[PDB]
């Protein structure tokens, strides 16, 4: 498979806003067997940070040297498994392949929904942390539209699940109303999260529990992002009290093991001008889109 | 005076923007047929009114004394031919006030020799979601005008704004208003015919939350939502003898409307109004109004149901005081389904304020009596229709205060139903209304 | 006080009703009969109506089925739940009536959400269940099993997207409008009314497509190919990215259909997974134009087109 993979990140580290850019760099690093290394042999990593290359706007994207584009972590790992000659990360047998695809799709569609909430709708995390990353990732004029668009998109998927001086004092009472609403919402979020992961863990037991699958790397990336935010201790406590300290500690140990891996299977590349995303290329692409 | 006077030649001022071959038509049809002085004055008035109605001159002044033989001099002030931006408001009948922007442009005579006027208008208001109108007027002749209308407008219609209706399409209209009546119809009667043809695509949506109420979720209303494309022909005849359009003191007025959607339906409607003053300074004004309407389904074997927007609706602060809007007629579950025939009558007695401190003000005491009926007639016989249309009416009386300003009419009434049906939406007590057309 | 003596007289409610409309709701209604012979123990306040996009006649069994997979799934689920039997023809064939559950053909614009199916329950105290409410009710009956919920979310996210993209893009308006529109059609332009209907289809085909991309968060999952429909440029920059997306969906949805072939054995009553597999197959094998999904399910999935027929004979007599 010859091509190039673009991602969110910098300095060889994927940023925490993209929960599947993190899960995709753990994927390549775990392809060490003879058949699995042929799956990703020839791929290169590029931290382009411009969605103008994506076919549908999402940066985890594969371009196969001849115009073929696939987007998202679900589609890339499904495409790659269909280029195995059949001659760490394990490969699932044919008898239980649909179940693995169902598990991976379920994580993408239901659990990755919650992590967008924790990143863009939780004020304690969006106000002081999330907005800072885009200043370092994007360019000077493109610093304000992207966080706003991502925040606006994040509530559409989560709306139906997580919902003189005297005037100054009255408006300060609105602040207290805001904390009342914020302590109302957390009970909905914690009730939905403990039900999603409880379904996922009940379904996952049907497969082998002693091997690492492509669907586990996306579930663990979500927890890594979700517990690595300043508002992460409350979730760390809530999940632990209801699932088990030993279990969540084992999962955190696995996350740490994945994070501390040598970058030898990686082969990355400095982005070229045409795929940088600067002002000139942004204007060129914007003009070409209407032509 | 009855001096035999002949007119030979007219000298105009500032008529460079209008073609002489089209101004001579106006002059020949109006001013140069006078044979005396009174007729000359009347023709000058008619010409001034016509030229201010066809948007050719803001106002006209004519000098006659220069000499029997004489030449009349006429003055025209050129309207602004460039872009004319205007804003304003209008008063809808059902207690809705609309605000509009209007960009008007006159077309130079070097392109079209017929006075042509193109304006683009933008509407908005409480019920109007949006409205764009493109209008083109052409003055074919001194007694005929041709209008082309292109419209796209979305609004709310029924009770509680339950329905949302969007219309897109076009209309072509011809308006014919004769200059002189045949001495049978010292007054200025108004008479005109109007023939129009339009094509419209409209969409109807039930924008009403199902959890809130069972309103608008009856079997009939669920079948009305959707898209339809239609074309209609139509005719309107208006005769107006009233001494003033908005504050009448004498005379009668008749309006007669027909429309036809070929192979689909045929609607006809008539209404008469009469006013009679009774006191030396018009203290006691009496007013009577009667309207009727009949709708027939022309489709084969009663296929192609008529849309709910084309049926007759009765009740409201304007139609029949004392009842809520869309508050009369048959109902399916809780929804007004209109009717194929109706009759409505109203009787008002205005009185000027008795106290000498306030006499010339337009505020007047009002006692009214209203009623009517609205039925879904069987298409069999007009005899059966009239037989079932003349019993068990729905009357209502009341007393209040009215302000009849030439711009609009305001009303505050205390109303009491006299007779009604069980499922009617009565409204007894105080009721407020404003608009232009009342009954 | 004494202002409650008015009105002086009150008459019984107006009993005049239009017969042009009552004939309209007879060509759009199909009645579910009971399983054991024919009987009725229902009151007008205890019967519901199911709103659907349109109805097609099955070739083999002859029953009337909804055209959309979600509508057909709900129709089958209601029949299984209440012990009903599928319809055969509209009430115009049987002028006489009695209290029974029925299925009614509605426009998309009969609710604020602009999506179907809906449930209309009761006569005097009437409740409207929307598409979202029906989805939540239908989904909350399989939460007992964690593995059956995984497949269920796969069908209506991957296969649903594959179906929706193909119907909207790779099929002509003359084929789209026969599935997601209640408008009449004749097939031969003879009378002047047959010219007013084709031009109506040409005008309104585009606005029906947009209201369909909002039913199951399609406008959120694919938010770049639903903004290409809301303008007129038809450039090749937006038409090359589109074919890349449509090729991924079809390739993914072939794996779903190939995987399902291994588990199509029902030891008794069909589950909500089998009724959802069958509805997609029945709706796909209705399309006349040779779309890629239909070609695939006719050539390589000759075992799914038999399973759907086997599960459909539980409800026809």
């Amino acid at each position: 498979v010859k091509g190039s993979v673009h991602l969110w990140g910098k300095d060889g580290k994927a940023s925490l806003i993209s929960v599947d850019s993190i899960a995709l760099v753990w994927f390549i690093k775990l392809c060490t067997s003879e058949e699995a290394k042929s799956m990703v042999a020839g791929l290169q990593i590029v931290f382009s940070n411009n969605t103008d290359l994506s076919s549908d706007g999402k940066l985890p994207v594969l371009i196969l040297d001849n115009g073929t584009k696939v987007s998202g972590y679900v589609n890339i790992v499904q495409f790659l498994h269909k280029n195995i000659c059949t001659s760490d990360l394990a490969i699932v047998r044919k008898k239980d392949r649909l179940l693995e695809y169902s598990l991976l799709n379920y994580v993408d569609v239901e659990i990755s929904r919650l992590t967008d909430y924790q990143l863009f709708l939780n004020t304690k995390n969006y106000n002081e942390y999330t907005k800072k990353l885009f200043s370092k990732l994007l360019y000077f004029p493109m610093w304000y539209n992207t966080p706003l668009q991502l925040r606006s998109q994040a509530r559409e998927n989560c709306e139906e699940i997580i919902g003189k001086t005297f005037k100054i004092a009255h408006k300060n009472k609105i602040k207290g109303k805001q904390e009342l609403q914020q302590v109302k919402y957390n009970l909905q979020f914690d009730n939905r999260l403990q039900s999603c992961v409880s379904n996922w863990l009940a379904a996952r037991k049907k497969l082998d529990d002693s091997v690492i699958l492509s669907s586990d790397l996306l579930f663990l990336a979500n927890l890594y992002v979700q517990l690595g935010l300043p508002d992460g201790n409350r979730i760390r406590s809530k999940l632990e009290q209801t699932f088990g300290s030993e279990l969540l500690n084992s999962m955190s140990n696995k996350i740490d093991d994945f994070v501390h891996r040598p970058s030898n299977n990686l082969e990355q590349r400095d982005p070229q001008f045409r795929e940088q995303g600067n002002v000139v290329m942004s204007l060129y692409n914007l003009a070409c889109k209407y032509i | 005076t009855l001096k035999p006077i002949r007119v030979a030649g007219v000298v105009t001022t500032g008529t460079d923007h209008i073609d002489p071959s089209v101004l001579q038509a106006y002059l020949d049809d109006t001013i140069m047929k006078s044979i005396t002085l009174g007729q000359l004055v009347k023709n000058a008035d008619v010409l001034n009114k016509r030229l201010c109605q066809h948007h050719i001159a803001l106002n006209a002044k004519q000098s006659f004394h220069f000499q029997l033989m004489e030449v009349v001099s006429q003055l025209d002030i050129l309207p602004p031919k460039t872009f004319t931006a205007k804003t304003g408001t209008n008063f809808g009948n059902d207690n809705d006030a609309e605000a509009y922007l209007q960009f008007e442009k006159l077309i130079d005579k070097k392109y079209l020799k017929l006075p042509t006027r193109v304006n683009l208008e933008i509407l908005r208001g409480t019920k109007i979601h949006s409205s764009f109108l493109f209008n083109s007027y052409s003055s074919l002749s001194p007694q005929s005008i041709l209008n082309l209308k292109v419209f796209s407008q979305f609004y709310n219609w029924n009770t509680n704004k339950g329905l949302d209706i969007g219309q897109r399409g076009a209309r072509l209209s011809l308006r014919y208003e004769p200059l002189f009546l045949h001495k049978l119809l010292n007054e200025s009667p108004t008479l005109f015919h109007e023939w129009f043809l339009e094509t419209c695509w409209r969409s109807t949506k039930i924008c009403s939350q199902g959890t809130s109420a069972p309103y608008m979720y009856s079997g009939t209303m669920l079948s009305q939502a959707g898209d339809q494309l239609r074309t209609i022909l139509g005719h309107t005849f208006v005769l107006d003898k009233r001494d003033h359009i908005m504050c009448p003191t004498k005379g009668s007025m008749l309006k007669w409307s027909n429309e036809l959607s070929p192979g689909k339906h045929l609607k006809t409607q008539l209404e008469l109004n009469s006013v009679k003053s009774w006191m030396n300074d018009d203290f006691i004004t009496f007013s009577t109004t009667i309207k009727t309407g009949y709708l027939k389904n022309l489709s084969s074997q009663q296929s192609l149901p008529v849309h709910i927007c084309d049926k007759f609706q009765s009740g409201g602060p304007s139609d029949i005081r004392g009842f809520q809007t869309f508050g009369l007629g048959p109902r399916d579950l809780y929804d007004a389904v209109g009717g194929d025939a109706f009759v409505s009558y109203g009787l008002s007695v205005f009185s000027r304020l008795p106290w000498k401190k306030v006499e010339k003000s337009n505020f007047r005491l009002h006692w009214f009596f209203n009623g009517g009926k609205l039925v879904n007639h069987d298409n069999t016989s007009l005899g059966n229709c009239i037989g079932q249309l003349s019993k068990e009416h729905s009357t209502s009386t009341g007393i209040g205060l009215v302000l009849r300003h030439p711009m609009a009419r305001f009303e505050l009434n205390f109303t009491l139903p006299i007779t009604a049906h069980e499922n009617d939406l009565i409204r007894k007590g105080f009721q407020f209304g404003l608009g232009l057309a009342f009954l | 006080r004494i202002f409650d003596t008015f009105p002086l007289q009150t008459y019984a409610a107006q009993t005049d009703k239009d017969e042009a409309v009552a004939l309209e709701i007879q060509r759009r209604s199909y009645t579910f009969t009971e399983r054991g012979g024919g009987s009725s123990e229902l009151t007008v306040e205890g019967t519901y109506k199911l709103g659907v996009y349109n109805v097609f006649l099955e070739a083999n069994t002859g029953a009337a089925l909804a055209t959309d997979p979600w509508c057909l799934f709900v129709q089958l689920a209601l029949c299984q739940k209440n012990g009903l039997v599928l319809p055969t023809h509209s009430q115009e064939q049987t002028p006489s009536h009695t209290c029974n559950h029925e299925m009614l053909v509605l426009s998309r614009l009969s609710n604020p959400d602009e999506a179907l199916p809906i449930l209309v329950e009761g006569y005097k105290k009437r409740i409207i269940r929307s598409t979202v409410a029906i989805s939540e009710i239908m989904r909350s009956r399989i939460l007992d099993d964690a593995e059956q919920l995984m497949y269920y979310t796969l069908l209506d996210t991957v296969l649903y997207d594959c179906w929706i993209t193909q119907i909207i893009f790779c099929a002509s308006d003359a084929q789209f409008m026969e599935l997601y529109s209640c408008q009449k059609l004749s097939g031969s332009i003879v009378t002047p009314l047959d010219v007013e209907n084709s031009l109506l289809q040409k005008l309104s085909a585009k606005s029906l497509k947009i209201s369909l991309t909002k039913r199951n968060k399609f406008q959120f999952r694919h938010r770049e190919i639903v903004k290409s429909m809301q303008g007129v440029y038809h450039n090749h920059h937006n038409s090359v990215n589109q074919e890349q997306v449509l090729n991924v969906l079809f390739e993914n949805s072939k794996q779903v259909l190939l995987g399902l072939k291994d588990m199509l054995k029902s030891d008794g009553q069909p589950t909500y997974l089998h009724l959802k597999i069958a509805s997609y197959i029945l709706c796909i094998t209705n399309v006349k134009e040779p779309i890629k999904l239909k070609t695939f399910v006719e050539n390589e999935c000759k075992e799914l087109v038999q399973f759907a027929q086997d599960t459909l004979k539980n409800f026809v007599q």
């Binding site: 907005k131 200043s135 610093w143 966080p147 005297f166 | 605000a99 908005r124 | -």
Partner: protein
């Protein structure tokens, strides 16, 4: 009551207009907006003043989509009504019973929120000003007032200095007595009118100091610093450039954010305006554009406008 006349005191301004020169003319907080706007103002008379205003806004949520304004001002009465979408009704009425006593009422209906009724009565004596403001007047069965009350007094001890106090009373339910807060206001005007200083001390120790300066006929500056042991403060500086063709306002805040608001006159009737605020430290950027057309309603006003 004899030496007061000999001191030749000057009538001080109102409590609400101490820092008017700073926060109203020099500053741009009230003028700032977002999105595109279009304004059509039509006046029908001047001596019996009457006019209407049509406002269209797009691209922003703070500004209403449609705004209608109608105001009438005669010699002694002012009445302004405003209608916004979703039936937002605003009404203001001023009436001067005398050259000293003025009484005004403001009523706002949000169509979904309780109606706000606001009364203000002010008296501008020869050497002092006293005003009383009430929000939601209400008296219980025992005759005890419930609502919001603001009573301010300001007297000039010398033609340059003006000292006074303000008392705010807030009673919500009426069962318990409302909270009372006392603040002090002071104002100084320079002899040559080069600069004007204003100071406010709140009941909690918070101090607000404002200064307005006029460098030349076309250039003015203003500074406003508020502060509250735990002391936190904010400083805002503003500059105003006045010209025949255009008027510029600029604002810089101690938080590291800047804002600009410029009204450019291009035509005798048309005047456009633009505004933009950025904050590099907080990554908060807002932009706004708009235009305003003034057109006479009556023929006399139209001919006066033309020549």
């Amino acid at each position: 009551h004899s030496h007061r006349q000999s001191l030749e005191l000057v009538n001080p301004g109102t409590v609400e207009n101490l820092n008017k020169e700073v926060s109203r003319d020099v500053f741009l907080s009230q003028y700032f907006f977002t999105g595109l706007r279009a304004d059509l103002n039509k006046a029908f008379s001047m001596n019996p003043a009457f006019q209407t205003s049509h406002t269209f806004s797009i691209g922003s949520q703070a500004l209403p989509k449609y705004a209608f304004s109608a105001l009438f001002a005669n010699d002694n009465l002012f009445a302004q009504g405003n209608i916004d979408n979703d039936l937002s009704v605003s009404g203001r009425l001023n009436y001067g019973w005398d050259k000293k006593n003025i009484s005004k009422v403001n009523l706002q209906i949000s169509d979904g929120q309780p109606t706000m009724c606001q009364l203000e009565q002010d008296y501008q004596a020869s050497d002092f000003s006293v005003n009383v403001k009430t929000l939601n007047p209400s008296f219980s069965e025992k005759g005890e007032f419930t609502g919001v009350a603001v009573a301010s007094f300001l007297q000039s001890v010398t033609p340059q200095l003006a000292l006074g106090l303000e008392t705010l009373y807030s009673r919500t339910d009426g069962s318990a007595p409302g909270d009372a807060g006392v603040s002090y206001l002071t104002r100084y005007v320079s002899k040559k009118q080069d600069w004007i200083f204003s100071g406010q001390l709140q009941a909690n120790g918070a101090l607000i100091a404002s200064l307005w300066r006029k460098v030349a006929q076309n250039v003015e500056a203003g500074i406003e610093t508020t502060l509250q042991p735990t002391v936190e403060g904010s400083t805002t500086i503003g500059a105003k450039y006045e010209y025949r063709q255009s008027v510029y306002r600029g604002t810089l805040d101690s938080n590291g954010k800047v804002a600009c608001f410029l009204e450019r006159k291009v035509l005798p009737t048309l005047s456009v305006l633009f505004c933009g605020e950025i904050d590099h430290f907080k990554n908060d950027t807002k932009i706004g554009c708009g235009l305003q057309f003034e057109t006479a309603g009556n023929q006399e006003l139209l001919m006066l406008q033309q020549g």
